[PDB]
Amino acid sequence: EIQEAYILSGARTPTAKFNGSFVSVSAPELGAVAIKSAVSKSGVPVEKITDVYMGNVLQGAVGQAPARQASMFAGLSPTVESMTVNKVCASGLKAVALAAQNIQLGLAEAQVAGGMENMSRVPYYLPRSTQLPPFGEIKLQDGLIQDGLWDVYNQFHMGICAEKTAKKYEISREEQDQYAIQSYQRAQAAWKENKFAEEIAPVTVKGKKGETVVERDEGYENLRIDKMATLKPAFLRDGTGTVTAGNASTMNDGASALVLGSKAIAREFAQGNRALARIVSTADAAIDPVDFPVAPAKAVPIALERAGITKDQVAVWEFNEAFAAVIKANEKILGLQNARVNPLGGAISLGHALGSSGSRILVTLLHQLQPGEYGVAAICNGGGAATAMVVQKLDRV
Amino acid sequence: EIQEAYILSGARTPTAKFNGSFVSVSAPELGAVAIKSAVSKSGVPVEKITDVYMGNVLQGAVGQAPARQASMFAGLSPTVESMTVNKVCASGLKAVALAAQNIQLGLAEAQVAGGMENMSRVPYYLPRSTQLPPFGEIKLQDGLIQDGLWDVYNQFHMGICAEKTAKKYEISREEQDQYAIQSYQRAQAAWKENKFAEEIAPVTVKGKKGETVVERDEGYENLRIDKMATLKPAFLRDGTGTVTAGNASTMNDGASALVLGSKAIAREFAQGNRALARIVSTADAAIDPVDFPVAPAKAVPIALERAGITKDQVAVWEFNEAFAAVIKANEKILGLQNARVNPLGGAISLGHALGSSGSRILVTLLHQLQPGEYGVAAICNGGGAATAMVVQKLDRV
Amino acid sequence: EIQEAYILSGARTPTAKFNGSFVSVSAPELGAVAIKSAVSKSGVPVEKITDVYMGNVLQGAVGQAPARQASMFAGLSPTVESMTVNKVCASGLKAVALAAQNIQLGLAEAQVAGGMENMSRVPYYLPRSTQLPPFGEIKLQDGLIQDGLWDVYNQFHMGICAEKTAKKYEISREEQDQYAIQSYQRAQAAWKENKFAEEIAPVTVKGKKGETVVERDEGYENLRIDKMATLKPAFLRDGTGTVTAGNASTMNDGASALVLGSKAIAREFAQGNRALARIVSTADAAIDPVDFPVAPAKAVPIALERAGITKDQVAVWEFNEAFAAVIKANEKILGLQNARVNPLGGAISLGHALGSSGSRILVTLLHQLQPGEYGVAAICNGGGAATAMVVQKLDRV
Amino acid sequence: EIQEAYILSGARTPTAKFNGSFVSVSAPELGAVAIKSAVSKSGVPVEKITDVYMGNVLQGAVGQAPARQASMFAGLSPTVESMTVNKVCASGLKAVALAAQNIQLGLAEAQVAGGMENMSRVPYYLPRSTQLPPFGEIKLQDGLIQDGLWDVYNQFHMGICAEKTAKKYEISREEQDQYAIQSYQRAQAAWKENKFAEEIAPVTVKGKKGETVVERDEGYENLRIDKMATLKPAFLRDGTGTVTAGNASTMNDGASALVLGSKAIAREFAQGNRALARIVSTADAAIDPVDFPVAPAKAVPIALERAGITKDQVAVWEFNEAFAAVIKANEKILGLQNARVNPLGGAISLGHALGSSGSRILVTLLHQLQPGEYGVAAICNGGGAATAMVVQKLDRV
């Protein structure tokens, strides 16, 4: 009596630059535009949707119950339950898996899930009087670094963890800069062909002078293939530095949302749906924190097993491009050198709104699968962990 | 083939006052102490536990992946997966349901779940350069208020939500103070008889020169019956105010954790476990944000329906005492005036560490049920929601 | 045996915009530039100069002993004594008076004196732990407001003081806005003909890529004659308001410095010096804090009396344009609507670096005086006071 | 033509501990209390007093025109002119020398002058948006440290300057501790005989429980002769260090004020005055910033020559006890190791309100001279400078 869960629809905001277009738009406002567009496209009447689960990594100053904000700003009923989920970078995918579980268990027939992040709006932390010294210099941490990008156990940046997977699998500066230039080109190629028009939910940002409609990603046109090899290593300055701002993910503001359904709900409302797919399997996996870059290589086989398919049976892989080194290490271990991996670009060129990325790569995946094809979305997360989902694209049922 | 999920064991830190015994101990350090104790008391080999789900509502400056830190500081393997959950005050119960689902779907045989909050260590928020005015006065938000206790939709304290439920259900200042007084007395009674010794995991605070072992809830000895009628309203000062510091929960630091298992794991390892129980059902439910106080009245029936039991079959009820007004309104609507609700005290007297409280009431519940008895934990949460769990205490499986 | 004191030099930095070209350049580093130039142009060997007195009304985060910093950055010997003076907006004129007094008493034969402010660099104030509340919202004062522009006794902006001087002496919105347009045109006319080239000392700003040389006042171009009449009252928002951002002075970053000498030093080194003049008198005067705008009307008569001259003998008046309402009020009381007041514009168009403006309007006066002419510099200051100096331009002796 | 100036009265507040009795009382309120007393003991009719000059080193968040605030809170007329003077630690004595100059030129007949500092109330500095990085950790400077106690040129504490002076003049840990023990003992002797009753103006602190009258210095009782030789160096902690919290100035809150008069005003109203004295000479001197400790040794001879007296004609020396090492070094250079130096204690035991201390030592010096005796107040200040005043105590004329 374990049931099956279907993706009926998917939408994402454009991915804006750090301190760019979405500075005045909170993560839940971004969530709201992704959820409004997902429910519209699902063909499901809003009253069947009973829960909104949204990933959000940096919750500081977002106000009470971020997920609940997104739900309410999307115009959903106050009767719809909600939850903000933090599996760091995996938050968005994990949220989709949690919503699927509600359907798999018979507890609900329709769900919305995804993620959201406004990195521009994460704040600095001032401790209260009892945790301040009585005199002398105070250091205030940036939430982006202390909560987002700093390993607790080995007290260094995620960038250093990548440096140590880059050496252990012999992934050079040149190999990394090659993958990054290719991510930028695939993104430019996909935008010229307009491959993101149907998944994208435009954000109307207000203001004093204007009203601007943002409908295009920000940062994918910034490729200077000249400069890329001329960049300093951003994290390791002991001579052996290979990760740079060029060949790593950028910080971004953005959101993404999907509507999920039972077999019954998919049949009645979703048969022609463009993003219609079965959730075949999900899997989480963890190893040592420093080794978070290769966690996906642990999660993917568990997911493939639970789906009873081989690697060769998945048409498209979407792995989140945290760092070029991450993709190349994971390509090596799973033997995916000639697989379709991030064909339209990834987080190096399209951006990384942390809480959203897990569900944004799923939205991108579903739009580039043919009927009957298996897809895989996998994303690594800080602390040494990863979430992978197997999806089968469908025309009906 | 939906499997059954069993609580094998349960522990909680003491609940320390705001700016007290735990200012130096981060929420995940507190988490690790409750987890260490729960796994130890479970009798399950540590390698069979595959996931740690911790509730935590105010994640600011806790550092990356708060639940991951709790799991590692507990000595659990880096192979153990984690996720930190934010359903505001319901976070800790929701985390237990989420872990139960892993077992129900056959994805794991043993879990740890619970919650943690250090309200002392919640920072103030300073926005970055791009959100600050060029000149003129700046307001820094506390963070306890902006993220914890401030409604986004009606821009006012959770306390005003309590005031409106107090008027609507004609719950008097005197009725509130009388419940508050009873909460204090029940907590003093319980501490005199040492009724919390089994469930409490002492915390070792490495102080200035020496080291203090905390094993006693702080706050429950602070009843001044005489002064109770003359306390100022904390939130509403128009003459109609009824909710005070006296009849409201306090801010607190603490953590709580349980070990869950499959039938196979309980049989082989937990026969006769002191806190052994079946998770018979769970329910989430939501209504208008201002009516969050009464959301538990909507969830409890759904959870009783899914257990196939009636109110009268519930031996004891653990409802979170967010405000006296909350417990009285729920007692009215569900007709539980003559049922055993919060027999040993609650949040008014024993404290409210937001992210922990949902799992803290479950731990307290399990230690006061006889073999074969049914119990309900229920907890309201900001944005207008609640979750309720039905448990059946057991000698063996 | 009271000796006379003469002015031999006279320099000022360009007045940069708030958050303009000098954000990187500390008020002392600005002072040093204006000092280096004024000692160079004096002809006096640097070893004869024994003291540096500099105005600076906003000293927060400037570092130890601002005036000292100015002196040392200016290359002057550690043997030179310094003091930083705060008479709010009079600070710069006051420091010249006090340096003159050293010469008037026979304690020294050569002094540098003047003023400096970097309002861009004025900080916000965070109370230490003993003056912070244990929880809830904190207000951080700007300091441009709290220390700079806020009357202590009547808790309102210097702007409100001006409003009450604008009503009392019936000075209308249109009368203010006329004077402002007039000021803006006199500054353009002056810069077109390049009149400030002699008095300005260019500031080389060291940047991340190259070096910029700033030689031009920033803000005198910004006249939109039409928009002036539609600008909202800045300070008084009950309908009756007349004072605007446009008809008021701006916040600015700049410095000014003069070299003073004994008769003996003037004769031996400074005959036919461009700036050469005798300080014939000074006077300070104070009234009610709200009436600080009309305080130059109490100080100029006293200063004339001590000079032993009549109003109609003074060639050029330089009153600081703190507001348009100020200049007009003082034109009505002294009967100067028929005299040369601020011929080359003032603080409305040329800016207002608080601590510098006193000595700035002095340098600007000395450069537009012909031999044997009497000039008066006068400057109102917050708390209800003013400082007036009478000079006599000289070719020799 | 140059007159001479008379001290007619002298008052100070008790010197309160850092974060002690005056936390809630702003520097200008403390100045007001000291001014009220000095005016009241002057037996000058208030309206003859035309100017208030007060030292204040740390003006941040004190509000506009600190000296004006002291004047107005004292009850003096808005008629009265004011100025706040910043010569670091020499501020209060320089203020007295400036006010005298007004009398010595014939510009006034009666002046108030002194200093004030609330080091408890000095704030931390948050730069505005334009001087903050776009992301990453921020350091907030205390303000006591950055403006008060940090050398700009060398980038180290005023305590490191003392450590250099200590080693250059072979002043050992034991020698420094002996002077500090002696300072505490002399201060205890002076308090047991009530030798400060005449000069101390008690401060009334309004609380949220009642009123407190503070009449006694805080800190002079804290001597533990045992624990003094066991204290860790405070500023040089590499093992080389000699200066401790014990043998250095404390941080303190306090204020001090004298009334000054013409020969004509002394005669008509101050014959008999307890504190009555002539200002014989005043001198400022400057050397290398690291050498500030020894700047008094350069300033004293200049002040003596201008007084036309020799060292031996001085009954009592008050040198501000910034560091025990500062006193012992100047004693060596000037050959005053056997002279009457700080007989009733100093800043090491009696505290050190920066802006106040220069005039505080002057009022202490006046109350221990006999008629016809010469006294010297000398005080080193940050940036490598000092101010010395020579007075002659007088019973009349």
Coordinates of C-alpha atoms in Angstrom, one line a residue, chain B:
Chain B
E1 CA 3.7 -2.5 2.9
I2 CA 3.8 0.5 5.3
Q3 CA 6.0 -0.6 8.4
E4 CA 5.4 0.4 12.1
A5 CA 7.8 2.7 14.0
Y6 CA 8.7 2.3 17.7
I7 CA 10.2 4.8 20.3
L8 CA 13.0 2.8 22.0
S9 CA 14.3 5.5 24.3
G10 CA 14.0 9.3 25.2
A11 CA 16.2 11.9 27.0
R12 CA 16.3 15.7 27.5
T13 CA 18.8 18.1 29.0
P14 CA 17.6 20.1 31.9
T15 CA 15.8 23.3 30.7
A16 CA 18.1 26.2 31.7
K17 CA 16.9 29.8 32.0
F18 CA 17.6 32.6 29.5
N19 CA 21.2 34.0 30.0
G20 CA 21.8 31.1 32.6
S21 CA 23.7 27.8 32.9
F22 CA 23.9 27.2 29.1
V23 CA 25.0 30.6 27.6
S24 CA 28.4 28.8 26.7
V25 CA 26.8 25.6 25.3
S26 CA 25.6 25.8 21.7
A27 CA 22.2 24.2 20.7
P28 CA 24.0 21.3 18.9
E29 CA 26.2 20.7 22.0
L30 CA 23.0 20.4 24.1
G31 CA 21.6 18.2 21.2
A32 CA 24.6 15.9 21.4
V33 CA 24.0 15.4 25.2
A34 CA 20.4 14.4 24.7
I35 CA 21.3 12.2 21.7
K36 CA 24.3 10.5 23.6
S37 CA 21.9 9.5 26.4
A38 CA 19.0 8.3 24.1
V39 CA 21.3 6.0 22.0
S40 CA 23.0 4.6 25.2
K41 CA 19.5 3.9 26.8
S42 CA 18.1 2.4 23.5
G43 CA 20.3 -0.8 23.7
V44 CA 20.5 -0.6 19.8
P45 CA 24.1 -0.9 18.4
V46 CA 25.1 2.6 17.2
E47 CA 25.9 1.4 13.6
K48 CA 22.2 0.5 13.0
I49 CA 21.1 4.3 13.4
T50 CA 21.3 5.8 9.9
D51 CA 19.8 9.4 10.3
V52 CA 19.5 12.2 12.8
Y53 CA 16.7 14.8 12.4
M54 CA 16.8 17.7 14.9
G55 CA 14.3 20.6 15.2
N56 CA 15.9 24.1 15.6
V57 CA 14.0 27.3 14.9
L58 CA 16.7 30.0 15.4
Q59 CA 19.7 28.7 13.3
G60 CA 21.5 32.1 13.2
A61 CA 25.3 31.7 14.1
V62 CA 24.7 28.0 15.1
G63 CA 27.1 27.2 12.2
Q64 CA 26.7 24.9 9.2
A65 CA 24.2 22.0 9.4
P66 CA 23.1 22.3 13.1
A67 CA 21.7 18.7 13.2
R68 CA 25.0 17.4 11.6
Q69 CA 26.9 19.1 14.5
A70 CA 24.6 17.5 17.1
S71 CA 25.2 14.0 15.4
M72 CA 29.0 14.5 15.3
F73 CA 29.4 16.0 18.8
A74 CA 27.4 12.9 20.0
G75 CA 30.1 10.5 18.6
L76 CA 27.8 9.2 15.8
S77 CA 29.6 8.0 12.6
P78 CA 30.0 10.5 9.7
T79 CA 28.0 7.9 7.6
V80 CA 24.9 9.0 9.6
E81 CA 22.7 11.4 7.5
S82 CA 21.1 14.5 9.1
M83 CA 18.7 17.3 8.5
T84 CA 17.6 20.3 10.7
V85 CA 13.9 21.0 10.7
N86 CA 12.0 24.3 11.3
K87 CA 8.2 24.1 11.9
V88 CA 8.8 26.7 14.6
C89 CA 7.6 25.4 18.0
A90 CA 6.5 22.1 16.5
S91 CA 10.1 21.5 15.1
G92 CA 11.0 18.7 17.6
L93 CA 7.8 16.6 17.2
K94 CA 7.8 17.1 13.4
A95 CA 11.5 15.8 13.4
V96 CA 10.3 12.6 15.2
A97 CA 7.4 12.1 12.7
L98 CA 9.9 12.7 9.8
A99 CA 12.3 10.0 11.2
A100 CA 9.3 7.6 11.8
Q101 CA 8.4 8.0 8.1
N102 CA 11.9 6.6 7.2
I103 CA 11.1 3.4 9.2
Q104 CA 7.4 3.3 7.9
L105 CA 8.7 3.3 4.2
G106 CA 11.4 0.6 4.9
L107 CA 14.3 3.0 4.3
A108 CA 15.9 2.6 7.8
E109 CA 15.6 0.4 10.8
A110 CA 16.9 2.9 13.5
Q111 CA 16.8 6.8 13.7
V112 CA 17.5 9.5 16.2
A113 CA 15.1 12.5 16.2
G114 CA 14.4 15.5 18.5
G115 CA 15.2 19.1 18.8
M116 CA 17.4 21.8 20.3
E117 CA 17.4 25.5 21.0
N118 CA 19.7 27.9 22.7
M119 CA 17.7 31.2 22.9
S120 CA 20.5 32.9 24.9
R121 CA 22.9 32.4 21.9
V122 CA 20.5 33.8 19.2
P123 CA 22.2 36.8 17.7
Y124 CA 21.0 40.3 16.6
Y125 CA 20.9 40.9 12.8
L126 CA 23.0 43.6 11.1
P127 CA 22.1 43.8 7.4
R128 CA 25.0 44.0 4.9
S129 CA 26.1 47.2 3.1
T130 CA 23.5 46.9 0.3
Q131 CA 20.5 46.9 2.7
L132 CA 21.7 49.8 5.0
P133 CA 20.6 53.4 4.5
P134 CA 23.4 55.8 3.6
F135 CA 22.9 57.8 6.9
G136 CA 20.3 58.0 9.8
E137 CA 19.2 55.7 12.7
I138 CA 19.3 51.9 12.2
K139 CA 17.1 49.4 14.1
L140 CA 18.8 46.0 14.7
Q141 CA 16.3 43.2 15.2
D142 CA 17.0 40.8 18.1
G143 CA 16.1 37.6 16.2
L144 CA 14.3 36.0 19.1
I145 CA 11.6 38.5 18.0
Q146 CA 12.0 38.8 14.2
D147 CA 12.3 35.1 13.5
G148 CA 11.0 33.5 16.8
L149 CA 7.9 35.3 18.1
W150 CA 6.8 38.0 15.6
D151 CA 3.9 37.2 13.2
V152 CA 4.8 38.3 9.6
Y153 CA 1.1 38.8 8.4
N154 CA -0.3 40.8 11.4
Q155 CA 2.9 42.6 12.4
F156 CA 2.6 41.7 16.2
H157 CA 4.0 39.3 18.9
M158 CA 2.7 35.7 19.3
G159 CA 1.5 37.2 22.6
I160 CA -1.2 39.3 20.9
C161 CA -2.4 36.1 19.1
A162 CA -2.8 34.6 22.7
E163 CA -4.7 37.8 23.8
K164 CA -7.2 37.4 20.9
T165 CA -7.7 33.7 21.7
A166 CA -8.2 34.8 25.4
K167 CA -11.1 37.2 24.4
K168 CA -12.7 34.9 21.7
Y169 CA -13.0 32.0 24.2
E170 CA -13.7 34.2 27.3
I171 CA -10.5 33.0 29.1
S172 CA -10.0 35.5 32.1
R173 CA -6.8 36.9 33.6
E174 CA -7.9 34.9 36.8
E175 CA -8.4 31.6 34.7
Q176 CA -4.9 32.1 33.0
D177 CA -3.1 32.8 36.4
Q178 CA -4.9 29.8 38.0
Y179 CA -3.6 27.4 35.2
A180 CA -0.1 29.1 35.5
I181 CA -0.1 28.7 39.3
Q182 CA -1.2 25.0 38.8
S183 CA 1.6 24.5 36.3
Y184 CA 4.2 25.8 38.8
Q185 CA 2.7 23.5 41.6
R186 CA 2.6 20.4 39.4
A187 CA 6.3 21.1 38.4
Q188 CA 7.4 21.6 42.1
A189 CA 5.5 18.4 43.1
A190 CA 7.2 16.5 40.3
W191 CA 10.7 17.9 41.2
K192 CA 10.1 17.0 44.9
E193 CA 9.4 13.3 43.9
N194 CA 12.4 13.5 41.5
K195 CA 10.0 12.3 38.6
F196 CA 12.4 13.6 35.8
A197 CA 15.6 11.8 36.8
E198 CA 15.3 8.9 34.3
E199 CA 14.6 11.2 31.3
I200 CA 17.1 14.0 32.1
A201 CA 20.7 13.7 30.7
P202 CA 22.9 16.0 32.8
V203 CA 25.0 18.6 30.9
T204 CA 28.7 19.2 31.9
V205 CA 29.4 23.0 31.5
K206 CA 33.2 23.6 31.3
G207 CA 33.2 26.9 33.3
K208 CA 35.9 29.5 34.2
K209 CA 38.4 27.5 36.3
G210 CA 36.4 24.4 37.2
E211 CA 33.3 22.6 35.7
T212 CA 29.6 22.5 36.7
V213 CA 27.2 19.5 36.1
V214 CA 23.6 20.9 35.5
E215 CA 20.9 18.2 36.3
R216 CA 18.0 20.4 37.4
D217 CA 15.4 22.5 35.4
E218 CA 15.8 26.2 36.3
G219 CA 12.7 28.4 36.6
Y220 CA 10.1 26.1 38.3
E221 CA 10.9 27.4 41.9
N222 CA 10.0 31.0 40.8
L223 CA 6.2 31.0 41.7
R224 CA 5.2 34.0 43.8
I225 CA 1.4 33.2 44.0
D226 CA 0.7 36.6 45.8
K227 CA 2.4 38.7 43.0
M228 CA 0.7 36.8 40.1
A229 CA -2.5 38.9 39.9
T230 CA -0.5 42.3 39.8
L231 CA 2.1 41.4 37.0
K232 CA 1.8 43.8 33.9
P233 CA 0.6 42.4 30.6
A234 CA 3.8 41.6 28.7
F235 CA 2.4 42.3 25.1
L236 CA -0.9 44.4 25.3
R237 CA -1.0 47.7 27.3
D238 CA -4.4 49.3 26.2
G239 CA -6.2 48.2 29.4
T240 CA -7.5 44.9 27.9
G241 CA -4.1 43.0 28.4
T242 CA -4.4 39.6 30.2
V243 CA -1.1 37.7 29.2
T244 CA 1.9 38.2 31.5
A245 CA 5.5 36.8 32.0
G246 CA 3.7 35.0 34.9
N247 CA 1.1 33.1 32.8
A248 CA 3.2 32.8 29.5
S249 CA 6.1 30.3 28.8
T250 CA 9.7 31.6 29.3
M251 CA 12.7 31.6 26.9
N252 CA 15.0 28.7 27.6
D253 CA 18.0 26.7 26.4
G254 CA 17.7 22.9 26.1
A255 CA 17.5 19.8 23.8
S256 CA 15.6 16.5 23.6
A257 CA 16.2 13.3 21.6
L258 CA 14.6 9.8 21.1
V259 CA 15.8 6.6 19.3
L260 CA 13.3 5.0 16.9
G261 CA 13.4 1.5 15.4
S262 CA 11.6 -1.0 13.2
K263 CA 9.7 -4.0 14.8
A264 CA 12.8 -6.1 14.1
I265 CA 15.1 -3.7 15.9
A266 CA 12.8 -3.2 18.9
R267 CA 12.4 -7.1 19.3
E268 CA 16.1 -7.9 19.1
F269 CA 17.3 -4.9 21.3
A270 CA 14.6 -2.9 23.2
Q271 CA 12.3 -5.5 24.9
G272 CA 11.5 -3.9 28.3
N273 CA 13.0 -0.5 27.4
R274 CA 11.7 2.1 30.0
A275 CA 10.4 4.5 27.3
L276 CA 9.3 1.8 24.7
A277 CA 6.2 2.7 22.7
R278 CA 4.6 2.4 19.2
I279 CA 4.1 5.6 17.1
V280 CA 0.4 4.9 16.3
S281 CA -0.3 8.1 14.4
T282 CA 0.8 11.8 13.7
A283 CA -1.1 14.8 12.2
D284 CA -0.1 18.4 11.1
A285 CA -2.9 21.0 10.7
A286 CA -3.0 24.8 10.0
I287 CA -5.5 27.7 10.3
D288 CA -5.3 31.6 10.2
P289 CA -2.0 32.8 11.8
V290 CA -3.7 34.8 14.7
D291 CA -5.5 31.5 15.7
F292 CA -2.3 29.4 16.1
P293 CA -3.3 29.0 19.8
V294 CA -6.3 26.7 18.6
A295 CA -4.5 24.9 15.7
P296 CA -3.9 21.9 18.2
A297 CA -7.7 21.4 18.5
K298 CA -7.7 20.8 14.6
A299 CA -4.7 18.4 14.6
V300 CA -5.6 16.2 17.6
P301 CA -8.9 14.8 16.0
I302 CA -7.0 14.1 12.7
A303 CA -4.3 12.2 14.8
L304 CA -7.0 10.3 16.9
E305 CA -8.9 9.3 13.6
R306 CA -5.6 8.0 12.1
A307 CA -4.9 5.9 15.4
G308 CA -8.6 4.6 15.4
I309 CA -9.0 5.7 19.1
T310 CA -11.3 8.2 20.9
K311 CA -10.3 11.1 23.3
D312 CA -11.4 9.0 26.3
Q313 CA -8.8 6.2 25.5
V314 CA -6.0 8.8 26.0
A315 CA -4.6 8.3 29.6
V316 CA -2.4 11.5 29.6
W317 CA -2.2 14.6 27.3
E318 CA 1.0 16.7 26.9
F319 CA 0.1 20.1 25.3
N320 CA 2.8 22.7 25.1
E321 CA 2.0 25.6 27.6
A322 CA 3.1 28.4 25.1
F323 CA 0.5 30.5 27.1
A324 CA -2.0 29.6 29.8
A325 CA -4.6 31.0 27.3
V326 CA -3.5 28.2 24.8
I327 CA -4.1 25.3 27.3
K328 CA -7.5 26.6 28.5
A329 CA -8.9 27.2 24.9
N330 CA -7.8 23.7 23.7
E331 CA -9.3 22.1 27.0
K332 CA -12.6 23.9 26.2
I333 CA -12.9 23.1 22.4
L334 CA -11.8 19.3 22.8
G335 CA -13.6 18.9 26.2
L336 CA -10.5 17.8 28.2
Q337 CA -11.2 19.9 31.4
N338 CA -11.5 16.5 33.3
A339 CA -8.7 14.7 31.3
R340 CA -5.0 14.4 32.6
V341 CA -3.3 17.4 30.8
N342 CA 0.3 18.4 31.7
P343 CA 0.2 16.4 35.0
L344 CA 3.9 17.2 35.9
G345 CA 3.8 20.8 34.8
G346 CA 4.8 22.4 31.4
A347 CA 6.4 25.3 29.5
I348 CA 5.1 28.0 32.0
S349 CA 7.1 26.5 34.8
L350 CA 9.6 24.0 33.1
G351 CA 10.6 26.4 30.2
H352 CA 10.3 26.5 26.4
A353 CA 13.5 26.0 24.3
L354 CA 11.5 26.4 21.0
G355 CA 13.0 23.8 18.7
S356 CA 13.3 21.1 21.6
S357 CA 9.8 21.6 23.2
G358 CA 7.9 19.3 20.7
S359 CA 10.2 16.4 21.5
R360 CA 10.6 17.4 25.2
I361 CA 6.8 17.0 25.8
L362 CA 7.0 13.5 24.0
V363 CA 9.9 12.5 26.3
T364 CA 7.9 13.6 29.4
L365 CA 4.7 11.9 28.1
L366 CA 6.5 8.5 27.6
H367 CA 7.9 8.4 31.1
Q368 CA 4.4 8.8 32.7
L369 CA 2.4 6.1 30.7
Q370 CA 1.6 2.5 32.0
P371 CA 2.0 -0.5 29.7
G372 CA -0.8 -0.6 27.0
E373 CA -1.8 3.1 27.6
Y374 CA -2.4 5.7 24.8
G375 CA -0.8 9.2 25.0
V376 CA -1.0 12.5 22.9
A377 CA 1.7 15.1 22.6
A378 CA 0.5 18.2 20.7
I379 CA 2.2 21.6 20.1
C380 CA 1.0 24.8 18.4
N381 CA 3.5 26.8 16.2
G382 CA 3.7 30.4 14.8
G383 CA 2.1 31.1 11.3
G384 CA -1.0 29.2 12.6
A385 CA -0.3 25.5 12.8
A386 CA 0.3 22.5 15.1
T387 CA 1.3 18.8 15.2
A388 CA 0.0 16.0 17.4
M389 CA 1.4 12.4 17.8
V390 CA -0.5 9.4 19.3
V391 CA 1.8 6.9 21.1
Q392 CA 1.0 3.5 22.8
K393 CA 3.3 2.6 25.7
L394 CA 4.5 -1.0 25.6
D395 CA 6.5 -3.5 27.7
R396 CA 7.5 -5.5 24.6
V397 CA 6.7 -5.6 20.9

